[model samples]
Target: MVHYRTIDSPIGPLTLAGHGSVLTNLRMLEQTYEPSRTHWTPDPGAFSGAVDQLNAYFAGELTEFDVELDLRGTDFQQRVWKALLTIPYGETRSYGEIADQIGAPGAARAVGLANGHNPIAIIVPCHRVIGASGKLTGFGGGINRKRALLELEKSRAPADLTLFD
Candidate 1:
């Protein structure tokens, strides 16, 4: 059976679900999700890595994650998600950049669609995606949260934009 638990964070409550000894889904909480229906092994250790990583990231002590993840999706979307990791922390990449990197320069919209389908949120670091115009773009968590996350990174990003005059 799929065993899981919820970890609340600044963005909101998240549901971390796992199958066997591996995580299967780490989604934003919804009333319809049921972990008992799938075959999952309940091990606190399985979630420890991801949990700790998230904690550190939000604390600004971490930029890149160091947890093993189990994200499921179509082959193309999976490819897009993997490419997301190539984006360095505190720096954002446009959908077009992702498309170009994947040898599909004309697939920015496709990459955006795949980005929207990401399940592992912060752990997968999907928030790093931005628009070509340098404006914050679509985020499953909402644009405000995106701006907040960017602010957090900006504190660590190499920029001279100071808080004071």
Candidate 2:
């Protein structure tokens, strides 16, 4: 059964979905793509850990997340998402850079497409991906939320942290 919960967050309401003890999705309320609610059950108990960790992250009290995630996507998408995880807090990577990191150089557009489809939002850090010229780009959660997230991270990030122009 797919258990889900909606929790209030700094950005907005976030819906967390999972099966058993593994998280499968963490989506902003306004983001693109909404899964069918057919067999989904509302169960807050199943997502306590994710909620707490997310709360701490927004509070600037946590950096790395230890939650177990079950990301479902194509192999290429998986590669792109994995690369997204490597971006440090307050740092950003262009889609082209991510494609190159996944050994798919020149596949920046493809990388952007995969990024737009990422199921897990903040924890997966898909918001960290930007345009190549150090400009903000498309985000599933909307540009305002993306900018807010980056600003939040930048505010709490170490003094020596590198940031996009």
Candidate 3:
């Protein structure tokens, strides 16, 4: 059975979908993603762990996500998504960097496309990928939300001092 929940988040009311304890999708309004319908059953309690972790992430009290995902992607895309998971909080990587990591150097554009196709956004860390020119490129959640995510992470940097306050 497909389970779903909608919660107000820093970005918007995020729709979290899962199946058998694995997250399938997490989409927000004003964003783009694959569209499909399933026998959706809204049950926030079914996704308490993800909701709590996402809440802590937005609150800057959490740096890593610990939720299982039901990710589906092409072989290259899967590799790209896996690389995204390694990106540390409060840091960014160029698309070229991801391409290199996946042993597909000179395929930065392809990497960007794969990154954009990530089914799960925040937990997969797609926002941490940037343009090779050191510019904030694009995000399915919109560039503004991407900036906010990055800023939120930045606010809790080790030297930010107020992290414990």
Candidate 4:
């Protein structure tokens, strides 16, 4: 049973998913994750830290997330996600940069795919990943949210920027 809850944010709604004390997912819509069909359990304490961290980011008090995240994906995508975390708030990196970070300079497209597939959202920090031309790229939450996040960060990014207000 996957535990889930909707946290209101600057964006529409944020869904935080976890299995026991470990958060396995964080989705933009917050409603996309179905706990009835997954192995997850609700633990308010598990979400406390992440919530506190996100609150700080949304308030422009942080630029890098320092919370413990549990991401679900293949080894390669996990590698890509780890690299996503390295991107500072309010800054942007092209797909090629992510490709290079993963030591696959010619695999920007593949890296971009993985970036799009990232499930943990702000925890993994995929919003910071941009296009080769420096344009905002794909984000599961939509490009507008991505742009807003970047702007928020520029306005004083916290590693875990979440809601709008």
Candidate 5:
């Protein structure tokens, strides 16, 4: 039984999915890939931790996410997502950098593809990935939301931090 819940967020409505306490996915409802609600059940009570953490994050009080995530993806995609986790709150990385981090230096395009398919959105921190030229790039949640998220983090990040060069 896949339990789900939609909560209001600074960016927009965010839908969270999982079974019990383990989070399997989190996406903005405005994103291109919408989770099918057929067999899913709505259970807001099950996502207390995620809600609290997200609220704290948006409030500029939390930088790291501690909720347990059951990320589902291929080996290469998993490797890419793991590298995404290393980006600091207000910092960013290019797809090329991600490819290199996962030991596939020439797989920057593949890294971008995997990033586009990342199931969990904000918590996985896919928004932190940018173009190699330090420019904003594709985001499932739209470029405006991407800009909003980055600005949110940049505003809250510790003193004298520049989000991009």
Candidate 6:
């Protein structure tokens, strides 16, 4: 059984989808989508833990997400998503970096395509992926939201964090 819920955040309204207590999707409200009446049930409390964590994230109280995921995707897509999870908060990697990390050297373009299709955006930290030029690029939640997420993470980082680590 699939469940759906909406939560308002500093960025905007987000629709969360899950089944069996594992969240499967998180989409920005601006996107055109309609929850199925028969197949999807509306349960505001279905993703309470996720919502609270997200709330804390926006408030700069939490850096990492600890929510269970029911991730669904192609094998390659899943690989890209997993690589994304390894990126610590307050830092970013270019698409090329992810492709290299996954050992598919020269597959940056493919990695970018996969990154853009990520279903669970912030929690999966897809926003942490950027262009090799260090410029912000495509984000399903919109580039502005992506910038906001990065800025939020940066502001919460420890002051003494070093690059020599």
* Candidates' RMSD to native: 4.5, 4.5, 3.0, 5.7, 4.3, 3.5
Please give the TM-score that candidate 6 achieves against the real structure: 0.88
Assess every candidate by TM-score.
Answer: 0.79, 0.88, 0.87, 0.82, 0.89, 0.88
Clashing pairs in 5: none
List pairs with backbone clashes in candidate 3: none
The true-structure Cα RMSD of candidate 3 reads 3.0
Question: Candidate 2 lDDT, tens digit per residue, 70-165?
Answer: 999899989998899899888888888998999989999898899878888998887898875666666544677888999989899553446542
- Which has the greatest TM-score? 5
Q: lDDT of candidate 4 vs native?
A: 0.75
The sequence of per-residue lDDT tens digits that candidate 4 reaches over residues 1-165 is 667665777876776877655677776754455454355444555577778777877887766676667787899899999898888767788888888988988888898899888878887888888776777776455788888887887776334456654
Looking at model 5, residue 95 earns an lDDT score of 85
Runs of candidate 1 with Cα error greater than 4 angstroms are 30-46, 139-141, 157-165
Worst 10 residues of 6 by lDDT: 29-38
Q: Where does candidate 6 stray beyond 4 Å?
A: 33-39, 139-141, 157-165
Candidate 3 lDDT tens digits, 40-151: 7778687888889998888778988999987897899889999999999989999889999999999999998897677788999888988857666565446777888888
| Model 3 / residue 42 / CA error / Å | 2.1
Backbone clashes under 3 angstroms, per model: 3, 0, 0, 14, 0, 0
- Write down the lDDT that model 3 would get: 0.82
118: Cα error in model 5, Å: 1.1
Error of 6 at 99 (Å): 0.5
lDDT (Cα, tens digit) per residue for candidate 1, span 41-63: 44555577678877888888887
Cα deviation of 25 in candidate 2 (Å)? 0.4
Residues 61-158 of candidate 5 have per-residue lDDT tens digits of 98989988888889999999889889989988888888889998789889888987787889888889888576666654467778999999989746
| Greater-lDDT candidate between 2 and 5 | 5
Question: Which scores higher on lDDT, 2 or 4?
Answer: 2
The superposed Cα distance between candidate 5 and the true structure at residue 121, in angstroms, equals 0.8
